[PDB]
Amino acid sequence: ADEKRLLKCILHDYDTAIRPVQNVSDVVNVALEVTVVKVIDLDEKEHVLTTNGWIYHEWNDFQLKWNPSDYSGLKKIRIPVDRIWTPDIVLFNNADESYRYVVDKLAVVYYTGKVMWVPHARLRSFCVLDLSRFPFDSQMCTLVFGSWTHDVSSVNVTLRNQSKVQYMIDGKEWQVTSVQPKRYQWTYNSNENYAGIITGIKLKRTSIYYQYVFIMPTVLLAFLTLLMPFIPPLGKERITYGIGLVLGCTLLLMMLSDRMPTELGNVPVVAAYLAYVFVMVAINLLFAIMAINMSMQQLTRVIDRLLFGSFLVLTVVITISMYAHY
Amino acid sequence: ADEKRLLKCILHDYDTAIRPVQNVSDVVNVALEVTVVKVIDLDEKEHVLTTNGWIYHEWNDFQLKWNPSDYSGLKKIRIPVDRIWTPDIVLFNNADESYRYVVDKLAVVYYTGKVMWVPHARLRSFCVLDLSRFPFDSQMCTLVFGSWTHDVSSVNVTLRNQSKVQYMIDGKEWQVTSVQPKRYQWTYNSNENYAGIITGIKLKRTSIYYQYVFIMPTVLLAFLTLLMPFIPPLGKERITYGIGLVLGCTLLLMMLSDRMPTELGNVPVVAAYLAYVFVMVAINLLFAIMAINMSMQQLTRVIDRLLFGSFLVLTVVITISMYAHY
Amino acid sequence: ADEKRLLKCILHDYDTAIRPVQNVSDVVNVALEVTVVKVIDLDEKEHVLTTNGWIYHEWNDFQLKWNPSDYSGLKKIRIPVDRIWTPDIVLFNNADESYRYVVDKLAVVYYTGKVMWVPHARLRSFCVLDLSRFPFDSQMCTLVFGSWTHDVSSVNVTLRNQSKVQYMIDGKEWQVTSVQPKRYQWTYNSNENYAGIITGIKLKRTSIYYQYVFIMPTVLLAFLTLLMPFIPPLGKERITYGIGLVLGCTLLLMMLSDRMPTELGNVPVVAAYLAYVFVMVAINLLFAIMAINMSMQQLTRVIDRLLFGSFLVLTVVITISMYAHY
Amino acid sequence: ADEKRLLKCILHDYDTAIRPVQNVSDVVNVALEVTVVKVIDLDEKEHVLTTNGWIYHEWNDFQLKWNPSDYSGLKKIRIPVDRIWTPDIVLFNNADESYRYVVDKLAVVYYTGKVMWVPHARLRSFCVLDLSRFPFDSQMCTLVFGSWTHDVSSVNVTLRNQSKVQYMIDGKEWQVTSVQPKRYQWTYNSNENYAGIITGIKLKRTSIYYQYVFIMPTVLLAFLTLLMPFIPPLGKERITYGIGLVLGCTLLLMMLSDRMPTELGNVPVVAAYLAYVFVMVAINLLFAIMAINMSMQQLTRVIDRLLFGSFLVLTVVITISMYAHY
Amino acid sequence: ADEKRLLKCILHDYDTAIRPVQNVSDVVNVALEVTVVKVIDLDEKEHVLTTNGWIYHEWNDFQLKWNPSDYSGLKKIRIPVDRIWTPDIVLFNNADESYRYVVDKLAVVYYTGKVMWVPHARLRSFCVLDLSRFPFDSQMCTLVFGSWTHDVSSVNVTLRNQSKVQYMIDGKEWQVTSVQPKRYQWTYNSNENYAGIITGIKLKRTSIYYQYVFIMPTVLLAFLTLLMPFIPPLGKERITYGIGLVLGCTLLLMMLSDRMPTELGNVPVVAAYLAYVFVMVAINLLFAIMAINMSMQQLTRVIDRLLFGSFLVLTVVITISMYAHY
Ligand SMILES: *[C@@H]1O[C@H](CO)[C@@H](O)[C@H](O)[C@H]1NC(C)=O
Ligand SMILES: *[C@@H]1O[C@H](CO)[C@@H](O)[C@H](O)[C@H]1NC(C)=O
Ligand SMILES: *[C@@H]1O[C@H](CO)[C@@H](O)[C@H](O)[C@H]1NC(C)=O
Ligand SMILES: *[C@@H]1O[C@H](CO)[C@@H](O)[C@H](O)[C@H]1NC(C)=O
Ligand SMILES: *[C@@H]1O[C@H](CO)[C@@H](O)[C@H](O)[C@H]1NC(C)=O
C-alpha cells in the first residue's frame, strides 16, 4: 500500500533523540494547550488536584516532509511517538512518582511537517489553597507545563493564541471556571532559562455536604449553649448539661479535625466558630459553678440575664459575620 | 507445521501502525460490545464503578487474507495483538492512571479477514449518581468506549445489532440490569468527529446494611425524642435526657458523615431525617428549659400534650413519606 | 557445553505463539492443580480472598523432543517461558488489575516432551460468602482456573487424578480445609465452550478477636439492660441510665458497622442481637417514662417485675439460640 | 580499552538460561547471607515485617574465567545481571505481589570465576507472632530464602560459615537482635528437595506509645471502678457514675479494637485486663442497683466494704501479675 | 544533519556497562548536589519525608570527546542515559520499593567530556525524628546519596564546592531551611569503602492545626478540672461532672492516639499534659468521692480550697513550662 511507502521512506534513518533543527542556532516552537474535561477532586488533605484532560502538543518537525502528489494525497498520517522525536514536557508541580498518559500511542503528522500529539491524561497537580473561608471558599489551582531538560535555546514552549477561549464545568462540588493561560519563564543557575506555560482554573466550592456536617451542628450547639443560662442552678442539672455540651463539642471537634487538613496556614471560619462555641461552653460552666458556689446571695437571675444578653448579641454578630462570608 | 507457514507468510512485512485500508478514503468498521460478568462495587465516595467484563472487538483486516485450501483448512488462527494492528479504543471516562487488560495476549483471526479480540478487563468507570434517595435509590451508570486518536474518517465504532439482548445480575447489594447500548458522537474542534459507543447499566440498591446502620437508629432516636415530653420537668432528668439525645444523634451524624460522600449534590433522605430529629431534640430542649424556667404557672402539661401531638402527627407524616420513598 | 547444544537445536525455529499440535484437529491437554501453602486473608469488606500457592501446569509439547543418548543423558532441562509456548490460563474470578506471578522465570522440560511450569503466585480471588452466622461461620471459597482465549477445541484443561489428596492449614483465624477439585465447563455464545477447573477450600472461622470485640460487650449491655428495671423511678436516675445504654449501644453499633461489610446479603446474628438489645433499651425507656409519668398509681413494682420476667425469659431464649449457633 | 576486550571475549556466546556446570551431574553452590540494616516496621494487623537489607549472593560461574596477565591485571570486573546467569532465589514467605530489588544493576565477577551480587532490597516478609504479652512482648520473625525452580540437584543454597557474626539494631520501638542463620530443607512431592536458608531476628518491643495509650487509661479506669463503692446509694449519682465507666471503657475498648489485629490467636493481657475492668463495672453496677433496690435494710455499708476489700485484693493480684509480665 | 554525525561517531561502539577510565587504576569523580524545590510532607506515622527536587549529577566521560570545529560548533549535545554510561547512585535510606525519576530521558554532554544529568525526582527518605516537643518541634532530616555497587576505587562521590549556597522554603507547615552538605564515608566488610554525600534539611513546624486540635482542648479541659472543686458535694452533680471530664479526656486521648505515631521514642509534651489532666481528673474524683463519703465532718470547704490552691499553682507551673517550650 501507499501508506507503508512514505512511512518507510521518511523513517529510514530517523533518530528519536536528535532535536529537529536545520541550523544549530535554531529552536523548535512547541505549542501547548491543556484542556480540562473533568475536575475529579481537590484533596486538600494532601494538597493535590486530580483532574482529567488532554494536553495539545503541536510542533514543527522538518524531517517529516513530503508532497502529497507522490503518494496520491494522504496529507494526514499517524505515527506512534515511540518512533519519532517528542519534546520532554512534563508538569512542573507533579504530585505522583512518574508522569504517564492514558493514551499516548498515536500522533498526527501533516504534509507540512507540523505534528499534533494530544495525549489524554489524568493529572495530579500540586496547587496552593488557603482555607480561610472553609467551606464557602473560592479557589484557584494552577497547572504548570514545561521542559526540564531542553532550555529556551533548544525548545520554545508557546501558548496558542488562535483559541483564546474560556470554558466552565458545572460540578456538584466545584463550579469550575477557567482562566486564560499565560507564559512564565523559570530560570536555572541565572544563565539557562527554562520556559513553561501556566494555566489557572478558578474553583468555587458549592457544597451541601460540609454545610450539613459542620455548619448546622455547630450553630445548633451554639443555640443550646445560649439556651443554657435559663436553667436554674438549684436543681443540679446545669453542670451535667454543660458537660454534655463539652462532650458534644468534643465530638464535633473530632469530626472537624478528621476532615480539616494538617497542611494548614490559617484557621477556617467553621473551626473558629467551633472554638468560640467551645470556649463559650467553658465560660458558661464557670458562671454556673460560681452561681451554685455562692448559692449556699440568691439574686443570681440578673447575672444570668445579662450573660444571656451579652452572649445573644455577640452570637448574632458572629453568625451574621459568617453569613456575610457566605 | 502448516500453522507456522501462513503466520510467516501474512506477517512477512506487516507493520503494526498502518491503518488497514485498501483505499485512502476508507474506514475500518470496529464492532464493539461490552458485556459485564460481575459488577464489583459502586464507590460513591469517589464516584467510581468497579466492574469486571469483556469488551468484544471485531474489525476487518484485509491484509490478513488467505484461502484454507492452500493450508488444508485452518480457518481459525490465533495471533497476539503485539504483532498485528489493533484499534486504540479506550474508556472515555476512565477512573485510573492507565487502561490495562486482564488478558490481552491472543486474538482470533479468520480466513475472511475479520478479527475478534475479546480482552477481559476490570473497568473503573466514572458515572454520575444523584443520592436524593439514599439508600433506597435506583441508579444508572454509563460506560463509554471510543477512540481518542482515530477520528470517524479513520475508524468507525459500531454497535453490533445481531445481538440485541439484555441481561441481569442478582447481586446482594445491586440488582443490576442492563440497557440496550447506543452510539453517541462526540465532536472535536467542531470539525473532527470522534465517535463512540455508550452502554448504560441500571443499578438498584437492595441493601440491608445501610438500613440497619442508618434507618433504624434514626427512627428509634426519633421515637425516644417523641417519648421525651412525658417526663415531668420538676425532677431534673429531662435536660440530661435531651443532652443524651444530642450526643447520640451527634454519634449517628458522625456515622452518616463517615459514610456519606463529600461529592454530594443533594442531601439524602436519611440525612434530612437525621437533621430533622436533631433539630427536634433542639426544640424539645428549648421547651424543657422554658418549662423548668417558669416552673419557679404549673399548668405546663397541656403545653407538653399539644407539643407531643404536633410532633406525633408531623413525625408520622415524615416517616410515611420516607416509607413511600421505599 | 552439551546443555547449549540441544537448547540451540530445538529452539532454532520455535515460535512462541504457535499452538503445539501435529494435526489441526488436535488439542493439548494442560493438567492443572492449584495448591495453597498459606491462606493470607479473607477480606469480606471487599469480598476478596488473598492466598499464596503454586499452580501446577503440565502440558505436552511435541516440538521439544529429543533422545538423551545424543546428549549423554540430560533428561531434565530448564527453559524460561518467554522462549517457549505457554497456555494462557488465568483466574476466572480475579480480583486485581492484572494477573502476575511471584516466580515465572523457569519451566522444566523432559525428554518425552511433557513440560512442567509451577509458577508460585499470590492469588486474590472473588468468592461468595454469606454472613448469616458471623462470626461463628463455616465458609467455602472457590478458585476457578481456565483459559479465556483458547476454547476446548484448542486446549483442554484437565485435573490430575493421580494425586487425589486433601490437605489442611491450621491458622489462628481460619481452620482451612481443602475440597477435591472438579471440572466445570463454561459456554460462550452457546457454541464455543471454555473449560476450566474449580477448586473449593472450606474456611472455618475460629476467632477470639471478634468474640471479645463484639459478643461480650453486646451480652454485657444486655445484662445491664436486664438490670435496669430494678431501679426505682422516683429518684431520677433511670432515664440517664437508659440514655447511657443508648449511647453505649450506639458506640457498639458504630464498632460493628465499621467492621461489618457493606456487601451484605443477610444480617449477622451479632447485628441482630445488638439491634434486639438496642430496641430493648428503647422499650425499657418507654416503660420508665410511663412509670414516672403516672408516678404523680404507686403500685408500679409488679409491672417492672413482669417486665423483668418477660425480658429474662426471652433473653435466655435468644442467648441460648446464639450459643446453639456456636 | 582493555575492559571492553574481556567483556566481549567471555560474553561472545553466553546464554543467560544455561546452568553453569561442566558436568551434567554437578551443582552450583550459591552462598547466601541476608543482612538487615534497618527493621522498618512490624505490621501485626497484616502479619508483615517490612525491613531493609542486602542479601549477599556468591556463586561460582566457571564460564567467566580468565587470567589477569593477558589483560594487565583487572581481577575485578562489573557486569549487569541481565547479561549473565543468576540463580532464581526468592523469599519463601514473600508478602507482596512480586519480588523486586532496590539496586540490581551490577554484579562483581572475579578472575577465579566467583561472582558476588549483593542486591539491596526492601523485604516484606510474613512471620508468625503470638500476642499473648502485648505490648510487653519479645518476638522472633524469620526470613526464608531459597529457590522455587532449581532443586538440590541443580543449585545448592549454602550459608557462609566464614562470617558467623551477630549484630543488633537499637530502634526506639524494637530492640532488634539477630540469630545465627541455619539451613532447613523443604521437600517437593517427597522426591525432589528444595533447599533454603532461614534467618531469625529476635524483636523486642520497648514502647512508650502503647503503654501511654492502653496501659494507663485501663489502670486508671480500674482505679475509678475501685473508688466507686464508697459512693452512698441514696443520692442517685452511683448509677450515672457506673454508666460513665461503661461508656469510657467502651471508648477504650474501641481504641484497643482499632489497634489490636483481627489475625489473633490469644487475647492480649491488656485486652484481658480491659475485659476484667469492664465486667468489674458490670458487677459493681449490679451491686449498686441491688443496694438502691432494697434501700426502700439500711445496713448496706458492710456489703460495700467487703466488696471493696475483694476488688482491692484481686485488683492488686491482677496488677502485680501484669507488672510481673513487664 | 551534523547532529546525527557525531552521535553515530562517538556511539559506534559504546558499551553502557564499561566504567569510563583510561587506566585501570583510575576512578571517575561524580559530582552530586541535591536541591529541594518543595518539601511535600513529613509523615511521622511512618517516619518518611516526601519531597520534590532535582539531584545534579556531573561526571567526566572521556570516551565522549570531540572538537567543535569538525562539527561547526555544537558544544552541547543531548543523549538519553539509556545509551551512555551512568553511575548507579541511589538513596541510602530509600523508603519505597524502587528508585524512579520523574524525568530521566535526557543528559547534557559537553565537548570537554563532562556530562550533566539532572534528573528531577520525588524522594521518599527515612529520617530520624524525636517528638519530645510535639508540635512545637524543630527538626532535621537527612538525605544520603551514594553508590551501593561501585566502591571508592571505582567511582568517587564528590560534593561541589563551587556553589556553597543555602536556601529556604516558607511552607505553611514547615519553615524549611537547608544545611551545607558534607561527605561521610561508609565502610563495607572493613576493607571496601562505599562513599556518599549527606544533606541535612532543618525543618521547623509552624502549625496552627495541631495547636487548635490538641493544645486548646487540653488546656480547656484542664480549666474545667480546675473549676471542678468549687462544686458543693451535697447535690450529686460533682461525680457526673468528673465522669464527663473522664469521657471528654478519653475522647481527646483517642484524638491524640490517632494522630501520635506508634514509632515513638519519648512522650510528647501534649501527651504528657493530657496524661496530667487525666490523672488530675482521677485525683479530683477521689477527693469528691471521699468528701461525699464522710458528708454523712461538714468542714469540707477548706480541703477543697487547699486542693484548688495546689492544683492552681502546679497547673500554672506546668502551663508556663509548656509556654516556655513554645
Ligand atoms: C518563544 O516564542 C515567543 C512567542 O512570542 C517569543 O516571544 C520568544 O522570543 C521565543 N523565544 C525564543 C525565540 O527564544
Ligand atoms: C459508521 O457506521 C454506521 C453504521 O450504521 C453508519 O451509519 C455511519 O455512516 C458510519 N460512519 C462513516 C461511514 O463515516
Ligand atoms: C478433555 O479431557 C477430559 C478428560 O477426561 C475428556 O473427558 C474430554 O473429552 C476432553 N475434551 C476434549 C477432548 O475436547
Ligand atoms: C550442599 O552444601 C552442603 C554444605 O555442607 C552439603 O552438606 C550438602 O551435601 C550439599 N548438597 C548437595 C551436594 O547436594
Ligand atoms: C575523592 O575526592 C575527594 C575530593 O577532595 C578526595 O579528597 C578523595 O581523596 C577522593 N577519593 C579517591 C581519589 O579515592
CSV table of N, CA and C in Angstrom, one decimal, chain D residues 25-62:
chain,number,residue,atom,x,y,z
D,25,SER,N,26.1,-34.0,36.0
D,25,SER,CA,25.8,-34.4,37.4
D,25,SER,C,26.6,-33.5,38.4
D,26,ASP,N,26.4,-32.2,38.3
D,26,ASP,CA,27.1,-31.2,39.1
D,26,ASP,C,26.1,-30.1,39.5
D,27,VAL,N,26.3,-29.5,40.6
D,27,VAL,CA,25.5,-28.4,41.1
D,27,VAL,C,26.4,-27.2,41.2
D,28,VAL,N,25.8,-26.0,41.4
D,28,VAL,CA,26.5,-24.8,41.7
D,28,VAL,C,26.1,-24.4,43.2
D,29,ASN,N,27.1,-24.1,44.0
D,29,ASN,CA,27.0,-23.7,45.4
D,29,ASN,C,26.8,-22.2,45.5
D,30,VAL,N,25.5,-21.8,45.7
D,30,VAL,CA,25.2,-20.4,45.8
D,30,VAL,C,25.2,-20.0,47.3
D,31,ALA,N,26.2,-19.2,47.7
D,31,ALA,CA,26.3,-18.8,49.1
D,31,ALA,C,25.4,-17.6,49.4
D,32,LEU,N,24.5,-17.7,50.4
D,32,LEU,CA,23.7,-16.6,50.8
D,32,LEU,C,24.0,-16.1,52.2
D,33,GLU,N,23.8,-14.8,52.4
D,33,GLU,CA,23.7,-14.2,53.7
D,33,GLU,C,22.9,-12.9,53.6
D,34,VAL,N,21.7,-12.9,54.3
D,34,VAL,CA,20.9,-11.8,54.4
D,34,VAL,C,21.4,-10.9,55.6
D,35,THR,N,21.6,-9.6,55.4
D,35,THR,CA,22.0,-8.7,56.4
D,35,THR,C,21.0,-7.6,56.5
D,36,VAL,N,20.4,-7.4,57.6
D,36,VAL,CA,19.4,-6.3,57.9
D,36,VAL,C,20.2,-5.0,58.3
D,37,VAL,N,19.9,-3.9,57.6
D,37,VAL,CA,20.5,-2.6,58.0
D,37,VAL,C,19.5,-1.8,58.8
D,38,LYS,N,18.2,-2.0,58.6
D,38,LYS,CA,17.1,-1.3,59.4
D,38,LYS,C,15.8,-2.1,59.3
D,39,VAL,N,15.3,-2.4,60.5
D,39,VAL,CA,13.9,-3.0,60.5
D,39,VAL,C,12.9,-1.9,60.5
D,40,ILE,N,12.1,-1.8,59.4
D,40,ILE,CA,11.3,-0.6,59.2
D,40,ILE,C,10.0,-0.7,60.1
D,41,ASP,N,9.2,-1.8,60.0
D,41,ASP,CA,8.0,-1.9,60.8
D,41,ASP,C,7.6,-3.4,60.9
D,42,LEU,N,6.8,-3.7,61.9
D,42,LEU,CA,6.2,-5.0,62.1
D,42,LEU,C,4.7,-4.7,62.2
D,43,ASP,N,4.0,-4.8,61.0
D,43,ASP,CA,2.6,-4.6,61.0
D,43,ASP,C,1.9,-5.9,61.3
D,44,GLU,N,1.5,-6.0,62.6
D,44,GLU,CA,0.8,-7.2,63.1
D,44,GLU,C,-0.6,-7.2,62.7
D,45,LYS,N,-1.2,-6.1,62.2
D,45,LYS,CA,-2.5,-6.1,61.6
D,45,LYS,C,-2.6,-6.9,60.4
D,46,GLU,N,-1.5,-7.0,59.6
D,46,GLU,CA,-1.5,-7.8,58.4
D,46,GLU,C,-0.4,-8.8,58.5
D,47,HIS,N,0.3,-9.0,59.6
D,47,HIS,CA,1.3,-10.0,59.9
D,47,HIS,C,2.5,-9.9,58.9
D,48,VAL,N,2.9,-8.7,58.6
D,48,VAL,CA,4.0,-8.5,57.7
D,48,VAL,C,5.2,-7.8,58.5
D,49,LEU,N,6.4,-8.0,58.1
D,49,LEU,CA,7.6,-7.4,58.6
D,49,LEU,C,8.2,-6.7,57.4
D,50,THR,N,8.2,-5.3,57.5
D,50,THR,CA,8.9,-4.5,56.5
D,50,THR,C,10.3,-4.2,57.0
D,51,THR,N,11.3,-4.5,56.1
D,51,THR,CA,12.7,-4.3,56.5
D,51,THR,C,13.5,-3.9,55.3
D,52,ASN,N,14.7,-3.4,55.6
D,52,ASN,CA,15.6,-3.0,54.6
D,52,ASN,C,17.0,-3.7,54.8
D,53,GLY,N,17.5,-4.3,53.8
D,53,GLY,CA,18.8,-5.0,53.9
D,53,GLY,C,19.3,-5.5,52.6
D,54,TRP,N,20.5,-6.1,52.6
D,54,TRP,CA,21.1,-6.6,51.4
D,54,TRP,C,21.3,-8.1,51.6
D,55,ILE,N,21.1,-8.8,50.5
D,55,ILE,CA,21.3,-10.3,50.5
D,55,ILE,C,22.5,-10.6,49.7
D,56,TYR,N,23.5,-11.2,50.4
D,56,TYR,CA,24.8,-11.4,49.7
D,56,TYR,C,24.8,-12.7,48.9
D,57,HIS,N,24.7,-12.6,47.6
D,57,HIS,CA,24.8,-13.8,46.7
D,57,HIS,C,26.3,-14.0,46.4
D,58,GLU,N,26.7,-15.3,46.3
D,58,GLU,CA,28.0,-15.7,45.9
D,58,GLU,C,27.9,-17.1,45.3
D,59,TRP,N,28.2,-17.1,44.0
D,59,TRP,CA,28.3,-18.4,43.3
D,59,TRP,C,29.6,-18.6,42.5
D,60,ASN,N,29.7,-19.7,41.8
D,60,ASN,CA,30.9,-20.0,41.1
D,60,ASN,C,30.6,-20.2,39.7
D,61,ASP,N,30.8,-19.2,38.8
D,61,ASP,CA,30.5,-19.3,37.4
D,61,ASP,C,31.8,-19.7,36.7
D,62,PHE,N,31.9,-21.0,36.2
D,62,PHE,CA,33.1,-21.4,35.6
D,62,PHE,C,33.2,-20.9,34.1
